[PDB]
Amino acid sequence: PFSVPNLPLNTLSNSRVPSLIRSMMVSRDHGQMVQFQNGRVTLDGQLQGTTPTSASQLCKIRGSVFHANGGNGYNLTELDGSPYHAFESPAPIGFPDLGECDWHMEASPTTQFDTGDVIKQINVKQEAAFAPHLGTIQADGLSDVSVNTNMIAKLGWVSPASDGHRGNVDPWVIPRYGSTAAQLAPPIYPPGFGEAIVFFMSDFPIAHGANGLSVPCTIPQEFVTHFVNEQAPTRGEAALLHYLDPDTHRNLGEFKLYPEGFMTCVPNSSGTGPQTLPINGVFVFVSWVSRFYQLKPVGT
Amino acid sequence: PFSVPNLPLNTLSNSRVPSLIRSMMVSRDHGQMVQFQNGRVTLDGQLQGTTPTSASQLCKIRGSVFHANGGNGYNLTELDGSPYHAFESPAPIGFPDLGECDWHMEASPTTQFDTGDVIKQINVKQEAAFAPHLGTIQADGLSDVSVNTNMIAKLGWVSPASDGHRGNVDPWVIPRYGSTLTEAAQLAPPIYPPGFGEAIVFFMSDFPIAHGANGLSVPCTIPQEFVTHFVNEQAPTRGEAALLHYLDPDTHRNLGEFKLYPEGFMTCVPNSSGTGPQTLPINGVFVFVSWVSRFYQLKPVGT
Ligand SMILES: OC[C@H]1O[C@H](O[C@@H]2[C@@H](O)[C@H](O)O[C@H](CO)[C@@H]2O)[C@H](O)[C@@H](O)[C@H]1O
């Protein structure tokens, strides 16, 4: 039988950045289509895009340093050191999906070292030499690292594109994985009947973010892990959820979780919808309903 | 009904550092006693020490910058910004438990910013002014940050203690959480091997460690996703130990027997050499078999 975690949202992680859920929101400006590659999972527990099981795999890169004429960078592997297979994902699992911005990362050797001198602040730009699908990315800060040095890089902060084609960091945009083409997790659309996609918002270090520090995702990481663990057969077109008060277990709103692993509500006329709900509530599965089951409006 | 995650180990996180499980081991040198404060949970889902629900809360510090008595640091809060209550727990939830080393962290404001110039490389030393239990730590790299600037710091790497009292980083050692007596601090209790040839199973992950006693390796007593699972399930503990099989999901073979105790740690009986689970593959899955007595004798594991 299908279930969602009985865990308060404010204790759970974003599925695109390793950061606690701070709020829920709907977006009129950005909610018409998203194609996030992290936080992508079916309700019967099939991982999609670059989505890992663990939050500890999120926004990390592993590779061997290459030195090329007018570029240095990484020949990419999976985080565990094993080969990257194109038949599995558009990039190695846990690869960041924050498109069209600079990635400021801390890179360390995957071999035992004595001193912090071998730890490098690197900058990955999304320009011509950004080709994760082809297994190669260019990175600044590697000029003094020996060729074939194996390193793990962890995303620290993001800033506007070095080439200046954008003024801000747009956390709704995914990368262009590179091609000469990647099998992306499919686009998510609001399915009609006044329904808006629910976004789980977390703060991440972003210089000039369109929404300041806020990064949206379509499902908490611990929900991803739960579905992968349970492998519950999908026995309906949508799973009806209640968002409960953690003290009283009283119903604060109705939500539909679709087989494609994203969630919707109908926001109240006023505007905000789930944004006015408290963030220490718990989702509970009620029953399977049709994809045209009409939800009561949520919020003020 | 009690269960453990049906997920391969190599896809799961260490519960002390946010890093994938690379191997299992028993420890002759360190396995007689551990008192890790992260990865601490009962089988019926009670969090202990500083253990968070989420791997994303691990090895993070949140606080407001102070300048006092020629030393700079943080008045600590919980990671969600809510107040840290002193004299109640060893430290805020997710606070690192890597004792007697320097913590090199990246600190960023919890308020929107325009430039990366506000992002600071800080060093937290475990010296006289390291008092997380009292809700205060000192850090190098904060002299140029305005008083009351609210920041989250994320652990990047650790190195030997600046004061030189130790030559390497020992990842088996927990912090001294103030000038308070360890007995008066509200620590998750010590874990002992329970007898009958049983050794504590340690889940090993690589973390960026300069001059580590075990190189990059950090041990923990349970995968983070196991912690979350027990907190979610709240399964009543109906036995003295939970018997597990470690299965190869590809070959359909039982690779070894393990006992998971109510205190949330796992044991095996290692072979004569004492290498035990270290030779097992890391892509296996644990499954709950049944509740057994503390005297239930396990088949030896390894080579
Ligand atoms: O050995 C203690 C200490 O080592 C590093 O500090 C050294 C410093 O002692 C030396 O004089 O200069 C180098 C070059 O930058 C380092 O700053 C670590 O930084 C420190 O955390 C501690 O591990």
Author numbering:
A (entry chain D): 231 to 410, 414 to 533
B (entry chain A): 231 to 533
The paper states:
NoV VP1 can be divided into two major domains: the N-terminal shell (S) domain and the C-terminal protruding (P) domain. The P domains form the outermost, dimeric protrusions of NoV virions, which plays critical roles in receptor recognition and host immune responses. HuNoVs recognize human histo-blood group antigens (HBGAs) as host receptors or attachment factors that play an important role in huNoV host susceptibility. In this study, we provided both phenotypic and structural evidence to show that huNoV DSV and VA115 recognize a group of glycans with terminal galactoses as ligands.
The results showed that two oligosaccharides (117 and 373) bound well to both DSV/VA115 P-GST fusion proteins with significantly higher binding signals compared with the remaining 583 oligosaccharides. Interestingly, only one oligosaccharide molecule bound in each asymmetric unit of the complex structures, since the remaining oligosaccharide binding pockets contain steric hindrance for oligosaccharides at crystal packing interface. The positions of the glycan binding pockets were located at the outermost surface of the P protein near the interface between the two P monomers, similar to the typical HBGA binding sites of other GI huNoVs. The binding interface of VA115 P protein resembles that of DSV, in which its “bottom” is also composed of the four conserved residues D332, H334, S389, and P390. Similarly, in VA115 the Gal forms five direct hydrogen bonds with four conserved amino acids, D332, H334, S389, and P390, as well as G394 at the position corresponding to Q393 of the DSV P protein that does not participate in direct interaction. P390A of VA115 was the only mutation that did not change the glycan binding ability of the mutant P protein, presumably because this residue interacts with the trisaccharide through its main chain carbonyl group. The structural data showed that the two GI.3 huNoVs bound non-HBGA glycans using terminal Gal as the MaBS, explaining the mechanism why these huNoVs could not bind HBGAs.
